[PDB]
Amino acid sequence: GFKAGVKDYRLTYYTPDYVVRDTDILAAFRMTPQPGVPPEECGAAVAAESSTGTWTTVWTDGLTSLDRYKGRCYDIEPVPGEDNQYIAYVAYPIDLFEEGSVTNMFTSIVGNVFGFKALRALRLEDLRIPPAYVKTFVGPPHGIQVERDKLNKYGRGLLGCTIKPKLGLSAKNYGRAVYECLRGGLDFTKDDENVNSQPFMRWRDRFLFVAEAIYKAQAETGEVKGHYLNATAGTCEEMMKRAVCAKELGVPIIMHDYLTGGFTANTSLAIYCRDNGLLLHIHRAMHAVIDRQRNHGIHFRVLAKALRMSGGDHLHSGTVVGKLEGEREVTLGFVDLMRDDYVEKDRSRGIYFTQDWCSMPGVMPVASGGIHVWHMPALVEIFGDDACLQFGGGTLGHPWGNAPGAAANRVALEACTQARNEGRDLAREGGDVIRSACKWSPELAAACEVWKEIKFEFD
Amino acid sequence: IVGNVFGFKALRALRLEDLRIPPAYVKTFVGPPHGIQVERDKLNKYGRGLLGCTIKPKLGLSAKNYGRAVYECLRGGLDFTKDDENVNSQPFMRWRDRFLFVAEAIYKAQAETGEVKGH
Amino acid sequence: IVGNVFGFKALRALRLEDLRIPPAYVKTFVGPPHGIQVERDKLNKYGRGLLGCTIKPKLGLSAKNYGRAVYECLRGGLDFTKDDENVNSQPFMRWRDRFLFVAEAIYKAQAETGEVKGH
Amino acid sequence: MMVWTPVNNKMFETFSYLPPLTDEQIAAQVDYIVANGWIPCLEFAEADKAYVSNESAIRFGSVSCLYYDNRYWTMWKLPMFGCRDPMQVLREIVACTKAFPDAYVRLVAFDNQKQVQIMGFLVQRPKTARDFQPANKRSV
Amino acid sequence: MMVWTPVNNKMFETFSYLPPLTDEQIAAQVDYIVANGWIPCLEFAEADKAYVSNESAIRFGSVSCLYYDNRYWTMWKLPMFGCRDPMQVLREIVACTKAFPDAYVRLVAFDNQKQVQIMGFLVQRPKTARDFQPANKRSV
Amino acid sequence: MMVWTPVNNKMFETFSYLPPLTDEQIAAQVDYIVANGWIPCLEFAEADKAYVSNESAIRFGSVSCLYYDNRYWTMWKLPMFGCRDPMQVLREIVACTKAFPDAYVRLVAFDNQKQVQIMGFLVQRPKTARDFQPANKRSV
């Protein structure tokens, strides 16, 4: 029967007895209800207003099967060391989601609920993307293996470098810096995330000069080189226009700011990249707006899963040790989430769900921002070979210029890799390995000298 | 503006509160396709707020039922109905099916009420 | 699954009797354009089997005759008629000619009976 | 301030920015290989077919993104599957360099789980090669 | 009527149509550079990478308009920012030609206001170079 | 385990994987030609124009599928139509090699019913040719 009026969400949307299905999408929200709102009701409100329910009873419910379609809050853990904070678990049936659409998935799960009066704060900590949903996505254009195969690069991290200053350089100068960095021994250089097309440097001009630098550096060194040309743009048409030109120039790799660009635009781009054999580097510009606070937002591991589904060959993972925040245990977790096929539940690392990627390719973590040669061993220790490490300042800030800057970092990374391989424990003999190499390499020595005192530790 | 700064170790928290978009920047944008005045003029609707209505449940309704609910809402005197934000294209109701039936609802409610309807 | 094996010397006969298509594979397919529920909704036909009819002779009828037969069948109360499986485009009847005449038949039977018709 | 030379300073991927590997540093790598259960293999190329180029792109339309000739070298024998003997790898490096004294030779190792080449470094440069620099004359 | 020779009369942009610059004419240019506040810099290239060509256009679609290889030369050290000393520039020209006796070397200057290279002329031709003509044998 | 050499082990289609033909193995092929009614002919090419390449594809759009230069060799005289004499063919092979001592030369035979070349093998390699291997040194 249809009974008009408001009732409790918990009556319909709290089902602590529910057995999750192998195809359900599962969410783990960090809930903070308003004083006097019972956890069970709050959790149900979240489940309800993220799937089938509204604030009062609608009659149309009876035309369909609410049982089949409803989001279900199915478990609540209290948070240790917290008065009013719970982890609410919601299961959403697979039918709720558009196949292949990260946009749709986020629209349901994080669309409205975070704004509810009935709660103080909400944070999405983890999602369990089931294989049957994963299989609906094209996913990364290439992934770690294929990328390594295309670039012919094996048994070490990759080295990159953001050109600086961020904005202000002309196209010709941009390419000049790019050639100098590349020829010193970096694999990649990149546009800064906000280098798009501007009055001081129009994108097509840049793409041309950068292509020239890529090729000069390649011929000179005999190693494959690349520059992440930014396709991020105001409109999809523009975004495509740039990706097309990059293809037309034969360059190996472009970049996109997925979060400021958006998922829709990003998925489009990743598909183009798959269809044309372009590598796709993903910059996470704006993530910190969403993922920085513990009480409210979406945790980065979710934004990384999302990106893996949308598509990207690289994603920035943070440095831990560099200028931007990133705790070590959590990072090691979402790096596994980015790279690996199968990741077991591990709450010590913030991993609330077993995630099975069912053969979706791995995204290469990019470690970037405020790092220099002294971090090298810590970096190689954290990420291993399957990572890309980037030295912007750490290269264009070297006292002898970009080529020596590059050479420094390349030697630093090569030394640590050899050390690691020879048995040396990098977590302990770190400083030793670096020091041996400075006394050996003039360019490295100059680098170590300048950034010896420079660390990022706080509070 | 909000690309990297929010993640700096040197700060605990950051919030963008406002931006001043100078006219000279403003003029480089196409901006809204129509805007309030033109919308009103196109819709032929004046001197009152407009009335709208999200179809419910959010998910789970078939295209045919969706259209049915739309028609009933629109004929009662609402100006607009709408797909829920997460109504896109799903196993229970594919978008083109929805679009077709909703179009039919719109036209039936329009003919019946003599007022311009939308969804 | 059925590519080479059925031809192996090491066996006398092979038959595939069933397959388990797992949900994770099923999800990768667009599948049927509409499906039973959406079809019924589109045609506005509920609560009985649908009635069809293959035009005969299989081959040999002109486009005009085809449409004629179609109109007569449809108006008597069949929901659908159809081209025979081997009616494609041939010397005695070219496909576009047939499409056009059949379209006309469909519409005539539809206006006459007031029931949605198809071919 | 020293200047990094453009002439002719051709490198060779992993470990080519370090000092050339001693017969013992090479053996330390092989231990790392067998320790981790990876498949060792040797590849070689003559002086020309050693560097990345793109002369086959004359046959292409706009589809030369991430296409370069001379990624593939020639396989020495077969990869050494389950061969957990560091001695026997070193012997094959010798057998190979002996058979192609004028070739570029590299040792590579495959991970079959991730299905990728997991490490690789050069073991022999040909003697006629004039396009590299010794580790100290790379900057003037 | 004299005939301007097509063989091998390769030029080098600004000032290469005048008689080669004396050590003092070079110094006069450097004064002009420092007088105007411009940033001096040195670039160099080996015999091949000196002239404009287009072998990377084999990888292109219909997009090779205003693309030529070998526009970029290799930077000698860094540009000399705020270095208002004419002596020290001439010393770096010497340091450079000394380090690369076989290279083409050019002096360039950047305006940072307009953000463009504001002048540039050749200071060293390699000795093996057979593709230029002395100023008097350009017409026969 | 022997390794098949990549340097310089250039082959020549039919029969070039066997040991080189004796004057009498050659004659045995000619008997097979005449026995079947096929038209014998001789073709030749200088050292360059002998191998398949693609330098004319620089002038092409996306239409270089199954286009290679140097498929066509130069015809020696004319095909020997209805000439049912094994002797005279061998004599022409000699006349040809004599006239072009430095050329690749091949014997070909046409079936005119099917209108196709029905066989073809090399008969002379030039003496300066350094890009082939003797049958025993193909694997080391």
Ligand SMILES: O=C(O)[C@@](O)(COP(=O)(O)O)[C@H](O)[C@H](O)COP(=O)(O)O
């Ligand atoms: O804009 C920058 O600062 C960088 O170019 C690094 O420059 P430097 O190497 O010169 O510091 C990167 O975009 C940041 O790493 C982004 O941060 P994250 O990786 O967290 O997204």
Ligand SMILES: [Mg+2]
């Ligand atoms: Mg940046």
Ligand SMILES: [Mg+2]
């Ligand atoms: Mg809504």
Ligand SMILES: [Mg+2]
């Ligand atoms: Mg039939």
